[PDB]
Amino acid sequence: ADALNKLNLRHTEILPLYARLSNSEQNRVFQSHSGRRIVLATNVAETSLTVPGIKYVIDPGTARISRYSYRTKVQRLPIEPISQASANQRKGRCGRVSEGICIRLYSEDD
RNA sequence: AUGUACGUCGCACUCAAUAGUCAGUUUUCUGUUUUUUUUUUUUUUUUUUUUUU
């Protein structure tokens, strides 16, 4: 969000979204705007939120996955590439209003 | 009582100077004084995720 604000995009605003977000700030994403808004989201909009007004989705193919191993004896959360169904779930969250373009920031064979 | 005896001598200092043996290629570094202090104690820094009589 700092990097998108530094470019100073014309007629565009940047919005965050996560589980720790304020309820007023969570609902502010749901309220309308003028022009184009860019929403930076986490796995909250993956599962339960179903944020509306989304045309194009950008997928890094990278998320954090909570784990717990016998060696660790500790809930470790390493950064890992996502699954196929989760990536295919990232395809469907922009085809809500009309036809959208999904961009995945990795290789097809990956 | 008488007569009775006398003469010459030596010594010192010395003593110099002698055989043969020719030659060794060209070039080179190495070199000087000056500011001097070599060392000054450190810090807390980020967030998949989601459900319970």
Curated annotation (Swiss-Prot):
It comes from the Bacteria. The gene is hrpA. Not yet known. Signal peptide: none annotated. Residues 1-110 form the Helicase C-terminal domain. This is ATP-dependent RNA helicase HrpA. Belongs to the DEAD box helicase family. DEAH subfamily.
